[PDB]
Design a protein around this ligand. Structure first.
Ligand SMILES: [Mg+2]
Ligand SMILES: [Zn+2]
Ligand SMILES: [Zn+2]
Lengths: 280, 152, 94, 65, 258, 48, 55
């Protein structure tokens, strides 16, 4: 009822050397059509904290005379009451709640997005804390299409970042018309001994062709020989290999390439959060 | 290999030297070229890892031949400066010329390199013994004789 | 499409072809390779990201014909083949 | 969360066939025969219909204004 | 000589045999069909109100994925510089129910969604959805939303099965079941691989020596499918026109150089 | 200046000003949480 | 006499610093290059005024 991940058409094959050492190659058109697309949320909290002696901070657009007043550009999305309009495009260092605090004239204490983030304001709520002070929360959503450096991992402990996004016409295709959505390096299998990955590929192929899901419940699961027999009966090679044609040259690859369907999940270790550079 | 890095989420840092002295030191003392041989054991530490070995075996495997299109394409892709193909070795059944992988690889080596050794694929020591016998006997046997005694 | 010449020696021509990709480059070189007067010809893409749409060519002849003549003849042959296929397809679909 | 409009791999439009497939399968027909009838021979297309989840109903009840 | 033979023709896909041409030409034709033929597609969306459970970007992408009818006569689809004609599609719906692709109203009657049964989003009671979508020509190499369809080919091969193999009747029956054409000689049975023909496991030991595959030179079995954006026969014509125009442009540039 | 808000629970329309209101309340159902509604202006979203 | 690589590095650094500060270049150089490759080309041509003193 709450799944996490998608089924990929994966072909085990070395391609241009861009998937050596655990890297993977992903098809561009599949990414365009919606594969592995995700969204990232973040919530900012601003509280109208009352101080001793009756002085309190206030939600309003700060005047250009206050201390610490940033440039007028950063306040372009603020309503009069100091709250940003929902569904307004925002970028780094832009303020969300305009707040001015009493001096320790008044100084700016507004809440602004993180310098290395961007997105669109999605939800703004106003409320009161447990002691009567006003409280607001702002949620910012960001669209994150897969790009180089994003981390992908299968269910058998096979992780990797995508190393190249290749156009569809350069992807090799199969005599049956299947174009893989993901290409993994054959060198990663023998040193890890994850036979479960290959068995799952065969099982996914069989389940897709047959029309019903395949049980993989540990020891009482469907034996792999039965899956191979069913695949052979359905009109495919019992080894899971197929003849493919090279995308660029258009000729026929000399070997028969193992190809199947494997469940893949996208981890949150995404490059858009790791990169940061320091100047001074 | 020298960095001991795998592309599964590993991160790296880079620093940009500012002064001219630091830049000169980095360029002359710290470039990747000068550190091919490892100080630890005196051998190389920079080289092929996974595909650079298997594909090399496929290219130089006994009985592997390539057509003219593949030869030209791979030579141009590798960046090798060439402007005329060598003489074809063996002709296809229908008449197309073919080139063995060994000559294509030899197009990369320098013009006066000469060496011989035993690799990890040696499983019939008798053939290696015969080849070593011939080489030691002459030190420069006619390449025709070596062809009959070739062994991967 | 615009030809940018890198090096022009005798019987040799190395140039970029900005605005193209594998689709036309492979067709052009394969049409060229059947010309008996071309000693060596190939194409490559130096980097799949930065030079994705800027192939690099190298054409060498035996001196009987300049490389430009070979390129023009190959393009003309491509045009003729495409026209013939189009006529055959139009006839067959009806 | 709702059914994808196009198959991820080959781009064939399969968005409008999901409800038909679900209703026919619930009636007890052979899923393979139903998929063949709908016209999905490549398993890349069949996977999209077979492995889909309809979470739009589950997430529709909470509104944000 | 060049010749084309039609094998089968449905209402949205066509399968034919192309003969007498080099592999490079077939690959070039396939690539041009895949990513050079232009079509209409939604590019930019201007929302006015969106109370649905789906974000604006998700709805915009779903709109982009919807196939659109593309007129053939009005526009020069084979040109190398597509014009910037824009078609505006609008929608205004609310209340309970499901918003279908057939509810889109197009200012230009010539361009409209092909399939009116694609669900866009489900609206609960009281939620409203109003927007304007803009469509323009594009190419498949720039974004997959502009792809006119799917296309692939394969070698035209004939499989020879020697009669000396016991139980070859089983292989013949299997080939007939797959639907491939099959004919018998005195010493062997010939199978034409219109579709892939993978040998069963127990017959693998006879491969190469008794079961061998013959490749007919310069013969490919194409397969073109469309989503209704263009007629399945117009796609090949447009691709060939594009190839001719590219060749002519290259000739002109080369002549300019010299 | 007076602004427009919507209740968290009942989803009705509630009008009040934060700078003056000493006690946020939905007069129809007593909810202490309010939403800020979407402004009625067109926004452009790229379908890419 | 042979230059140890440390000596060569220090010579290149000093020469590049002098060239950047405003010292003339003893050889013709292609336009649009930084002082560093200018000093490297100067060393490669063998035209170097600086010398090292060894104990
Ligand atoms: Mg690691
Ligand atoms: Zn599909
Ligand atoms: Zn209320």
């Amino acid at each position: 009822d709450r799944p996490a991940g998608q089924n990929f058409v994966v072909a085990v094959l070395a391609y241009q050397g861009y998937n050596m050492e655990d890297a993977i190659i992903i098809n561009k058109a599949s990414i365009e059509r919606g594969l592995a697309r995700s969204t990232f949320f973040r919530t900012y909290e601003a509280e109208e904290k009352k101080y001793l002696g009756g002085q309190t901070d206030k939600f309003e657009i700060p005047d250009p005379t206050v201390r610490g007043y940033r440039g007028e550009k950063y306040y372009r999305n603020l309503d009069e009451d100091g709250l940003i309009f929902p569904e307004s495009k925002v970028e780094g260092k832009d303020v969300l709640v305009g707040r001015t605090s009493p001096p320790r004239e008044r100084r700016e204490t507004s809440v602004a997005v993180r310098p290395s983030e961007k997105g669109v304001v999605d939800k703004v709520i106003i409320t009161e804390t447990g002691d009567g002070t006003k409280l607001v929360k702002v949620t910012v959503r960001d669209l994150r299409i897969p790009e180089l450096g994003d981390k992908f991992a299968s269910r058998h402990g096979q992780k990797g970042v995508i190393g190249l996004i290749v156009p569809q016409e350069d992807m090799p295709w199969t005599e049956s018309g299947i174009v893989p959505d993901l290409i993994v390096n054959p060198h990663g299998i023998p040193s890890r001994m994850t036979v479960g990955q290959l068995i799952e590929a065969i099982g996914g192929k069989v389940a897709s062709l047959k029309g019903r899901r395949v049980d993989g419940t540990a020891f009482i699961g469907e034996p792999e020989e039965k899956l191979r027999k069913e695949l052979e009966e359905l009109g495919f090679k019992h080894t899971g290999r197929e003849i493919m044609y090279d995308g660029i040259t258009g000729k026929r690859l000399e070997a028969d390439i193992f190809i199947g369907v494997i469940y893949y999940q996208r981890l949150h270790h995404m490059v858009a959060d790791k990169i940061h550079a320091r100047s001074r | 290999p020298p960095y001991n890095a795998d592309f599964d989420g590993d991160e790296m840092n880079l620093h940009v030297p500012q002064t001219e002295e630091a830049q000169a030191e980095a360029r002359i003392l710290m470039e990747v070229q000068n550190h091919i041989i490892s100080p630890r054991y005196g051998g190389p530490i920079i080289g092929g890892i996974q595909d650079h070995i298997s594909g090399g075996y496929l290219l130089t495997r006994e009985g592997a031949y390539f057509t003219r299109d593949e030869v030209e394409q791979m030579l141009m892709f590798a960046g090798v400066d060439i402007t005329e193909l060598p003489e074809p070795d063996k002709y296809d059944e229908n008449g197309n010329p073919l080139w063995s992988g060994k000559t294509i690889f030899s197009l990369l080596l320098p013009e006066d390199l000469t060496v011989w050794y035993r690799n990890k694929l040696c499983d019939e020591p008798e053939r290696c013994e015969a080849l070593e016998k011939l080489i030691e006997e002459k030190l420069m046997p006619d390449p025709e004789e070596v062809r009959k005694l070739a062994y991967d | 499409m615009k030809i940018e010449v890198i090096k022009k020696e005798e019987n040799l021509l190395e140039f970029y072809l900005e605005g193209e990709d594998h689709t036309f480059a492979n067709l052009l070189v394969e049409t060229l390779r059947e010309n008996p007067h071309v000693k060596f010809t190939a194409y490559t893409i130096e980097h799949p990201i930065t030079m994705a749409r800027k192939p690099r060519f190298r054409v060498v002849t035996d001196g009987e014909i300049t490389p430009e003549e070979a390129l023009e003849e190959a393009a003309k042959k491509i045009f003729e083949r495409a026209k013939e296929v189009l006529e055959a397809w139009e006839k067959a679909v009806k | 969360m709702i059914v994808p409009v196009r198959c991820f791999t080959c781009g064939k439009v399969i968005g409008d066939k999901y409800y038909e497939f679900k209703r026919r399968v619930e009636a007890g027909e052979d899923p393979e025969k139903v998929l063949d009838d709908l016209g999905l021979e490549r398993y890349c297309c069949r996977r999209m219909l077979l492995s889909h989840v309809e979470l739009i109903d589950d997430i529709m009840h909470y509104r944000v204004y | 000589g060049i010749e084309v033979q039609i094998l089968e023709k449905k209402e949205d896909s066509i399968k034919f045999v192309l003969k007498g041409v080099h592999v490079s030409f077939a690959n070039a034709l396939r690539r041009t069909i895949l990513g050079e033929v232009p079509t209409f597609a939604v590019d930019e969306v201007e929302f006015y109100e969106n109370d649905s459970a789906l974000f604006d970007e998700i709805i915009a992408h779903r709109l982009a994925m919807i196939p659109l009818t593309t007129p053939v006569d009005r526009f020069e689809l084979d040109a190398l510089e597509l014009d910037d004609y824009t078609v505006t599609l609008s929608l205004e719906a609310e209340g309970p129910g499901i918003v279908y692709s057939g509810d889109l109203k197009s200012d230009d009657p010539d361009v409209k969604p092909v399939n009116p049964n694609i669900p866009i989003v489900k609206l609960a009671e009281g939620q409203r959805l109003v927007f304007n979508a803009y469509a323009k020509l594009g190419r498949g190499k720039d974004h997959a939303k502009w792809q006119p369809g799917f296309v692939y080919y394969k070698y035209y091969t004939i499989v020879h099965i020697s009669k000396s193999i016991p139980e070859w009747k089983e292989l013949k029956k299997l080939a007939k079941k797959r639907g491939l054409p099959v004919e018998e000689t005195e010493e062997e049975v010939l199978v034409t691989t219109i579709k892939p023909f993978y040998i069963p496991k127990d017959f693998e030991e006879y491969e190469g020596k008794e079961i061998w595959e013959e490749i007919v030179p310069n013969t490919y079995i194409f397969t073109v499918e469309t989503n209704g954006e263009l007629p399945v026969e117009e796609i090949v014509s447009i691709a060939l026109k594009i190839l001719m125009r590219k060749a002519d442009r290259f000739i002109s540039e080369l002549q300019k150089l010299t | 200046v007076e602004a427009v808000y919507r209740c968290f629970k009942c989803g009705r329309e509630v009008k009040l000003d934060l700078s003056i209101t000493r006690d946020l309340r939905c007069p129809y159902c007593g909810s202490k949480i309010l939403y800020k509604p979407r402004p009625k202006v067109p926004r452009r979203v790229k379908a890419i | 006499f042979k230059y140890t690589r440390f000596e060569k590095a220090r010579i290149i650094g000093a020469r590049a610093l002098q060239i950047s500060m405003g010292a003339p270049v003893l050889i013709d150089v292609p336009p649009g290059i930084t002082p560093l490759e200018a000093a490297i080309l100067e060393f490669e041509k063998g035209v170097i005024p600086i010398t090292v003193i060894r104990p």
